[PDB]
Symmetry: D2
Subunit: 452 residues, 4 copies
């Protein structure tokens, strides 16, 4: 039901084990904002799965083989051929991480006033689209916004919505479709191959380009192998390769499914766009031959992307997340369903119905969770959705327990679940928050609170 880790522990990261009374003072020193906690005071850090992964012995051997040459590095060639083989795109440009690739794509592929349509959006991706003049259009199925609705492949694009956008706006005014795998904001929900194929067919008939946000494509491939009829006999690598065969290019944060702590890249099949991409990468990232990465990190990412294709690794990755979700759900703790590939999302408005929204139940729930167990989590609701000129009220008001790859055990998942549940058994005791410091911008990062 829940497989054991398909690897051994090679080396350990020492943690402190400071007790509850001391954690309380550390939380109070952070003004009750988990973003202000220091890493040295954290037992289990579930802020994000981005860049927090444990590398393997083979990756660390590659780390000693960094060819740091400015051009012509063996590490660059290894990453290049690995991505060409596993993803099937003609051209690759490394970037220091995913939002560097998004910066390049959005400048290369958007004319001001055009539309970018996607299955929901991610913060940085949509910023770079809009900064370059695009209008974002959400074409995900309506169900993906219903947090409790347990349906498969919730990340799928609604073809009816895409058709409507083409009819109302015209194909020439659509810069591209942005298809993300998995869909982070919906809870890490996967996209079916049938949907990628149908989106490809409809866009190609109109000459519209498709670019993937590939950041968790291996988790997505696992959901396809597990749940999409006809893929039970296909390897993860076969599934990944077919996925990208329905795309014109992709942006990738290697910090996610390539099992590294830094790294990303931009892929594309078009030669002229590749030429333009090489001119632009020099401005922001570095020469096309390293893209703002040390040689040893191009090497680690090449090795990690291939490790991620191992069935047992990605099965265990996803089922470990699922174990945390299953234990919370069996206790009645309200969560986004179905559990996604990389995180369990608490529904904090359901958790703290005794507190009003304006008392910040997600922030105070995250604070309570650290004090009782030593775990940090992130905000994924109104605050992240931004404010609107004419707030950006989201249906998904979530607190994220984000699982780094290969870092934690099921016993760590139990510490997390036991603490969230023991809190949930006295849920009414948790206390609302009020600001005592709020900056104008990026407030989730440095704002400070106190109890009402």
């Amino acid at each position: 039901n829940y497989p054991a880790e398909p690897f051994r522990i090679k080396s350990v990261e020492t943690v402190s084990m400071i007790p509850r009374d001391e954690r309380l003072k550390k939380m109070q020193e952070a003004g009750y904002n988990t973003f202000l906690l220091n890493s040295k005071d954290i037992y289990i850090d579930l802020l994000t799965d981005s860049g927090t992964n444990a590398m393997s012995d083979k990756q660390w051997a590659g780390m000693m083989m960094g060819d740091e040459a400015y051009a012509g590095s063996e590490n660059f060639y290894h990453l290049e051929r690995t991505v060409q083989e596993l993803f099937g795109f003609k051209h690759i440009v490394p970037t220091h991480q995913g939002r560097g690739a998004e910066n390049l794509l959005s400048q290369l592929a958007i004319k001001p006033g055009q539309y970018v349509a996607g299955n929901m959006y991610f913060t940085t991706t949509r910023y770079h689209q809009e900064k370059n003049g695009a209008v974002f259009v959400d074409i995900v199925r309506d169900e993906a916004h219903d947090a409790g609705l347990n349906i498969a492949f919730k990340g799928d694009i609604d073809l009816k919505k895409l058709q409507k956008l083409i009819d109302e706006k015209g194909a020439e005014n659509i810069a591209y479709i942005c298809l993300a795998v998995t869909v982070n904001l919906a809870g890490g929900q996967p996209v079916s191959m049938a949907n990628m194929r149908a989106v490809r067919e409809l866009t190609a008939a109109h000459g519209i380009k498709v670019f993937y946000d590939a950041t968790r494509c291996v988790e997505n491939a696992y959901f396809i192998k597990e749940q999409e009829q006809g893929f039970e006999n296909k390897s993860i690598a076969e599934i990944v390769h077919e996925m990208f065969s329905y795309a014109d290019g992709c942006t990738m944060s290697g910090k996610k499914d390539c099992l590294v702590n830094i790294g990303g890249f931009l892929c594309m099949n078009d030669d002229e766009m590749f030429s333009s991409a090489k001119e632009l990468v020099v401005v922001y990232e570095g020469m096309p031959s390293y893209g703002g990465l040390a040689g040893r990190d191009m090497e680690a990412m090449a090795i990690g992307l291939r490790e991620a294709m191992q069935y047992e690794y990605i099965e265990h990755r996803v089922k470990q997340v699922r174990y945390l979700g299953d234990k919370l759900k069996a206790a009645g703790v309200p969560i986004v369903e179905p559990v996604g590939g990389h995180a369990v999302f608490l529904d904090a408005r359901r958790f703290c119905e005794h507190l009003t929204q304006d008392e910040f139940p997600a922030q105070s729930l995250a604070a309570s969770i650290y004090v009782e167990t030593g775990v940090r989590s992130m905000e994924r609701g109104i605050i992240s959705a931004g404010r609107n000129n004419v707030h950006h009220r989201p249906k998904l008001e979530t607190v994220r327990l984000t699982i780094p790859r290969r870092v934690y055990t099921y016993a760590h998942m139990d510490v997390v679940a036991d603490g969230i549940i023991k809190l949930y058994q006295h849920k009414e005791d948790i206390r609302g928050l009020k600001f005592i410091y709020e900056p104008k911008q990026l407030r989730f990062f440095t704002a400070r609170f106190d109890y009402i």
Copy 2:
């Protein structure tokens, strides 16, 4: 209760995950001898807790700071200060691992014909004692030889036996007392502080030296903290320091409780013996300032011994082993009791009570465990006992066991479940396990390269 890992995974070691049918072929190519399996074919390797530990990020940082100088390495001085602080001995000599320290001690402290008495024995330790002319005497409590008896501090020396030896042989004819912590041969059983003090008191009244085999002294310290009344407010480091205050020196395999993959050392308080040890170490190991270790490894061992003093680390280490024993015992699987600090020992005589010992039930059980789970375990039964080469008969040990030896910080509870679930499943059909026979038996060291086939 079983605590969560008081650490995170910093990096992982790749494993193959081959399925049962392919494990059966690897087991057959190994002649059904788990000692012959390739490491790359093993998912969970419980052959030994020696030298198989996972180091920390701080140790690996130390590995980048190896001062490889032949004499005067900063890493030696760090190892020296650390052992002087944590164990309290005056002098320390590094050795490449534990049996190199034993070689030195036995040459330094034994005159031929003298007796060495200990709480049971370990093979390398006793060999070096006997090779240098000592006669071994077991002075452990009789309870330690009852593998089913669930009692605390089973490793304790019987003071009456030690008193008896002093009276019959004479104090001047006893080279030293060899007190091991924990006691490996009894299943990893701890020694109480009460016992260490009484032994120190009795030997000191007669001028007799006491040297500890300190290889799992931190596991031992945890049992004292957990179970000896009056130690509940003492830190692991306090307990360790007090333990060694009752010895004249020690031999240590860092490969066990110092959380490293190689390394050991010899400690002593006597200045004259220290001079002689420095003269001998150059013969077998290296200079007194590196003792057959790279500078980076003295550094890793210095850091790891200090890491081992963290209460939550050693609590979890010992309770992870206990989890494995508890789950087996709850399904009725026969094991040595109580569970020791580092391993669970299956009682293969009872597990395979349809087989005779001449059909090698421990060897066969270990083969079955690997086939069913990808877990390697060690035969510790008639095969490892060897054959009497005077008579040609097997040595027939009372203990016919399979050792599930747990490396420190390498595995999780889910790995422990893989081990337990597969053993419990084997146990539910234990009568189906077949006997083995030799098809190749070397003259010596037969457990290492012997090959078998099913009867």
Copy 3:
């Protein structure tokens, strides 16, 4: 005098050692464009001193201690304290390297139509200034444009030009002064402390901000210690701290003087600009607590910046480059003078005075150097200048040079001899060097992938 390396080799990087005939084939397969050679085919790679440095054992120990947390990493706090101590700025934001910091600064500090004035320019720096609407003005001393003039502190800003700009355009229309240390385009020439103070004094009287391009500020500090009277009793760290006391902030490529393979940062004293920078860094680089770097790299950069303050290290760094220039100059080989902190620039116009600039003498000289020695160098001449795409004509730079760029702590004087001996041998038969012509020219970034063949 040329000091010995004030370090030992801890580990080496394997190289192939292919002979001349096989180097000729690799050069031909690269289309005679050294930017196209494979790193594995190069013995001594002098393409750039950026990101190619050798780290120390202490830095590699830091690499094992990467706290990879998304926010609040211990490595960030270490980098923060270190830069606050050594540079003296109030606020620091990591960026993945120097041009990421430049992107942020130019967006934060420039209103469209304003002027940015500097001591010459660097390509990425000036691009981000112009992309955000600034007009660039060169206020370096006229001497810096005379490549043969052997004078000290050639990088100094002409205070009269800065005064002239303030009077003609108005102080409110100057976004900031961009003072680079050293000045790359003049050959790596240093700026005097006297000049930094005078610039600070003049700009402060008008409310004008000053930001340093601090990429080789430690090389710059060494020239001040060596050649500016009154600094002979000052430590490198004292000089560095005083330099930055005359700026409102800086952009830094750690890939140069912080002795790392990746990393950079943005510094400033202004609280309001710091808030805005924290809002912008999330757009392009990452959180203010990692800025597009792994935790291990913030750690390595923190350790390396502090290592760079050691006098003997930077003395040897700069004198190793000087050794290369001196040996070339003594054989009559034409170079930019005086030699800068990080590179020797061959004057390929004069070296190949039998070729026209349209025959690409720098590109060809660099191809010849690799064939004869296995040394890679960078074309910094008409090819890198690019083609005017409005008119189709080459951009024709006054400087037609080959850059021998020296990575820090990677090479020895014997490697410098390989470079010099081969160049001197080429020079003794310089008339034999052939012109090149395009056989493939990309529309943009032509120095990176253009291919050539001999005329």
Copy 4:
């Protein structure tokens, strides 16, 4: 004439650069014994080439791939096949370093009262021979004991002496011939292939076994390629393999020519001796499958032994030593000739003729050299030769400047030479030593002196 380093610097070992006045106090704190100096106070440490080498990036990648299994390690199999391929012996037993292999060989191959004959001897090797009851006989050519005599292949065995030993003692009373390559005590002097072939032919005709001390066999192979007629077209690896084809087994300290910081092994062709070796290694070293080494060190040594076969590496290794020797000899500094593979040996009785032997000119010369430059060196004369029951007066009274592999540059060699020469230009100023502390045993290690 002197090639540049055939590698780049990947990482540096930080040193202090403390000046002369501070070095003087550190030397005085060491009682004027370089063995008592702390490594952190040393710029250039030339005490020994044993275990002090710089590893490569590929070796450090292998260090991250340590398979620490007690039996069946991939690292063991790699070392095993590498040694079988490069040395050609049937069986290999790892040991933690060379004297662990000597302990095994001497117990396996010596009956009490038998003779072991060799081309000179080394300290640990001869101790293990004699401890197991053998009588040592030196059968090196007489010239090898003449330090100033510049002749090629000074390490060669005198076949006339070997013949005499067989005739006087009888073949059955000779346990084995111990042939070392190079010969350390003679100054690192090489042995010719012609001599290894002739020793093999004579011993085999009498049934006498030959075991090599292989510790610097790659340096030896370089001397053969450079100087022995007919080997100029042979690769280093071809030469090494032919060398060991004239032996029944060998002891190897990997700490020397295998380019590692720890490690060694015992090789042999005989099956019964291998079986006996496996039983004995368990007592002293570890199981035959790791022999007292971590897996990662078996890996590093397998990689390093193959790196040592690169012609340009070993040419530069030897010529760097030769450069130091040439610069001293051009200044009139008296040295052992010809310069050997691993060290330059000062002749300190010729250097300090104004001081008597009993004033310890070698010790005080080593002290002076550290104070003026930051360099440590070792004693190789009477003190190392031991005392005799009925001193062991040696013709070779040498101070060794021992060069670790891949650690230092020619500029470091110049610091060393310039300091020894500037001393030699005022040689008469150096001051004799007297004991202020002398232990009974191992006195070179901890004894303390003062100036007369």
